């Protein structure tokens, strides 16, 4: 559908899950994400995630 999980740790971004600590609304495009967002889990940049 439009899910993205980190391959470093394994934290499904889930657009519906978005992010609470960072300033993200519930249901945000993974492309509209800030230009400084990074795997808030481990840290891995936004280039480690892979559509499901």
From Swiss-Prot:
Signal peptide: none annotated. Keywords: Cytoplasm, Electron transport, Formylation, Iron, Metal-binding, Transport. Residues 1-52 form the Rubredoxin-like domain. Its cofactor is Fe(3+). It is found in: Cytoplasm. The modification N-formylmethionine is found at residue 1. It holds the Pfam family Rubredoxin. Its main location: cytoplasm. GO terms for cellular component: cytoplasm. Fe cation binds at residues 6, 9, 39, 42. It comes from the Bacteria. Binds 1 Fe(3+) ion per subunit. The keyword Transport applies. CDD domains: rubredoxin. The keyword Nucleotide-binding does not apply. One of its GO terms (biological process) is alkane catabolic process. PANTHER family: RUBREDOXIN, RUBREDOXIN-1-RELATED. Belongs to the rubredoxin family. Rubredoxin is a small nonheme, iron protein lacking acid-labile sulfide. Its single Fe, chelated to 4 Cys, functions as an electron acceptor and may also stabilize the conformation of the molecule. This is Rubredoxin. It comes from Megalodesulfovibrio gigas.
């Amino acid at each position: 559908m439009d899910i993205y999980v980190c391959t470093v740790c394994g934290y499904e971004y889930d657009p519906a899950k978005g992010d609470p600590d960072s300033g993200i609304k519930p249901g945000t495009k993974f492309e509209d994400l800030p230009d400084d967002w990074a795997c808030p889990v481990c840290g891995a940049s936004k280039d480690a995630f892979e559509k499901q």
